[PDB]
Design a protein around this ligand. Structure first.
Ligand code: HEM
Ligand code: HEM
Ligand code: HEM
Ligand code: HEM
Ligand SMILES: C[C@H](Oc1cc2cc(F)ccc2nc1N)c1[nH]c(=O)ccc1-n1cccn1
Ligand SMILES: C[C@H](Oc1cc2cc(F)ccc2nc1N)c1[nH]c(=O)ccc1-n1cccn1
Lengths: 146, 141, 141, 146
């Protein structure tokens, strides 16, 4: 992913302020509420029957934190996203059979969450830089399908 | 397909936008043009510079169409027939672009109305925007 | 969103299938399982061997649901509510799978009814299958 | 794209019987009729206002023959689709900005056309082999985005 130096600076500064205990769980929770077929992949999490049950589920919170960690790994390796996500791509494709469109959906839900947390600070140029990042992550996760 | 709870959530959330409808419409377009530059190909005739009066004017038209869609949520094919003819027959907008604008509107609402943007409301608005998108991209005449 | 001509085109094409509906349904499923093996994950409990009675039986149920959808084309959320409960609430079928089955049904119709499978009819059937798919994958209760 | 020896034989035998003057034009024509926004990329073709105008349009026929030629080239280079179509991918992705979902749609319309022409001979195992082919071609056309 190519970011301009101004984009790289704005992306890094915002990311450093991300609440690590909330943002990931909220992005995953919203994926499960907004796109309910994604719940099929998380039957071991128990109760996901209502938005309140999803958002307060500790497995959603913990898994969401792992998902946030992987996006963070992407930001540390923007020049080698395919290589960084190789093992994750094999897991999601070959084992879980997650349709790649769902990767794009999660990336965009994460962008909605960053907007929700940062408000006016999540400006249209800041969003544009984050869209390049999440598209690169979704593409890297879908690489083993390609 | 919208549930009765989705319709209530959309009416409440879109009602909270109120007087700012046009502002949110304009910001969603700006976010779309900057985040997904391919979308600019549909607007060669627009001044797309930041704070352009044309983008502000168009933003109000988009937002007003959405208000009209909410006001006729169970009769959208009939109420939006003229917009469907424009987007599907005349402009031939690729449906992917509707997903992009819908996402940018959700981002704008998440940034400016955080108290309203609950997971349940986010789900209802996403379904509403997808239903409006299906109507605008279909030829049903 | 379906036009009046789309409804007529679907009724004509699906009417020509007539009594062999179950056969077309079974073949579409077989094509789906062989072409897109990930779809088999929804049927671990089925005997999926060639000419399996279970696939034949299921093919008839799918085809009969489509006949019912055609017969209630303007009232699909209400008429297909039990099938939406099953696919959207219980099974949580990823919508991509409906695009795969829809494509395999179009292939089956193209192979067996070539005189009926005109470009206009292909367009109407594709729209009809997408509308049925939206209903079966949406939670609207 | 990996085809079994039985798949390679059945794919080659069917492909050898394809009417080179019809099949490509019919697949492109059906793409334009079934997914009407694709017409935006072909404004130089003139009248595309009705299914009969599309199907009898000589620019649709000639361009469709070029599209069929590229799928024919894909079948000859299943082990190197990305390299073979590198220039074609630069045209569609960097110059035309065709959304990648449209490449999948054309591949599937081509499958519908093959079924239309071959009838009972386009068996479910024959279709399965052709689906592997068209997914690979669509993936190679979209590679310059990745
Ligand atoms: C594009 C964004 C995504 C990222 C960065 C991502 C990242 C991750 C990570 C880091 C793990 C943990 C792997 C480990 O422990 O070794 C994981 C597991 C998993 N992911 Fe994803 N994922 C994404 C999208 C998805 C989507 C869209 C789905 C399903 C709809 C999904 C379903 C799963 C499942 C089912 C597991 C296994 C969880 C378990 O152990 O029960 N992921 N993902
Ligand atoms: C929620 C989705 C959308 C709604 C409600 C919407 C609404 C509208 C409205 C109300 C107009 C003005 C029609 C008039 O003048 O009477 C319009 C124009 C137009 N829309 Fe959309 N639109 C939507 C999505 C899109 C998208 C995704 C694109 C392309 C990326 C697009 C491209 C256009 C263009 C090019 C025009 C003509 C603008 C002009 O010349 O003034 N629209 N739209
Ligand atoms: C046009 C699209 C479809 C229609 C009209 C349809 C229709 C049906 C019908 C009528 C039943 C039987 C319900 C009953 O017993 O009363 C059923 C069952 C089911 N469908 Fe679908 N279906 C469609 C697509 C799909 C797809 C795409 C999948 C997954 C890839 C799927 C998976 C299932 C499963 C797993 C069952 C339960 C089968 C059993 O245990 O007997 N269906 N479907
Ligand atoms: C995945 C299947 C596809 C294949 C194999 C394919 C193949 C081709 C080929 C071989 C050419 C001619 C390039 C040359 O001059 O050597 C071409 C041109 C082009 N293709 Fe595609 N294409 C595909 C999909 C698409 C789609 C989906 C669209 C648009 C929706 C598209 C739009 C075009 C356009 C606009 C041109 C330039 C035509 C002109 O000169 O006026 N193609 N394509
Ligand atoms: C009035 C509307 O009628 C239809 C909606 C359809 C949507 C489709 F995606 C395909 C076919 C449809 N057919 C309908 N008759 C309707 N009817 C309902 O029983 C439930 C929800 C609902 N709805 C309102 C806005 C969006 N959905
Ligand atoms: C009865 C049905 O009502 C709706 C369909 C909707 C489809 C959507 F995708 C989103 C919203 C919809 N809202 C409706 N009221 C309807 N009404 C029409 O005026 C035209 C075509 C039509 N149709 C029949 C089958 C599929 N479309």
């Amino acid at each position: 992913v190519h970011l301009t130096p101004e984009e790289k600076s704005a992306v890094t500064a915002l990311w450093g302020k991300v609440n690590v205990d909330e943002v990931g769980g909220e992005a995953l929770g919203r994926l499960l509420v907004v796109y309910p077929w994604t719940q099929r992949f998380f039957e071991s999490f128990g109760d996901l029957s209502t938005p309140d049950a999803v958002m307060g589920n500790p497995k959603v919170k913990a898994h969401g934190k792992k998902v946030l960690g992987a996006f963070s790994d992407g930001l540390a390796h923007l020049d080698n996203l395919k290589g960084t996500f190789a093992t994750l791509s094999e897991l999601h494709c070959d084992k879980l059979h997650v349709d790649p469109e769902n990767f794009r959906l999660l990336g965009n839900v994460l962008v909605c969450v960053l907007a929700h947390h940062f408000g006016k600070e999540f400006t249209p140029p800041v969003q544009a830089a984050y869209q390049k990042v999440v598209a690169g992550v979704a593409n890297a996760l879908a690489h083993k399908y390609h | 397909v919208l549930s009765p709870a989705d319709k209530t959530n959309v009416k409440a959330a879109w009602g909270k936008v109120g007087a700012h409808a046009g502002e949110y419409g304009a910001e969603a377009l700006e976010r779309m043009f900057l985040s997904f530059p391919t979308t600019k190909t549909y607007f060669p005739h627009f001044d797309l510079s930041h704070g352009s009066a044309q983008v502000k004017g168009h933003g109000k038209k988009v937002a007003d169409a959405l208000t009209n869609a909410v006001a006729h949520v169970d009769d959208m094919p009939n109420a939006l027939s003229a917009l469907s003819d424009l987007h599907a027959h005349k402009l031939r907008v690729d449906p992917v672009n509707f997903k992009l604008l819908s996402h940018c509107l959700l981002v704008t609402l998440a940034a400016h109305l955080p108290a309203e943007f609950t997971p349940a409301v986010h789900a209802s608005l996403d379904k509403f925007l997808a239903s409006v998108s299906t109507v605008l991209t279909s030829k049903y005449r």
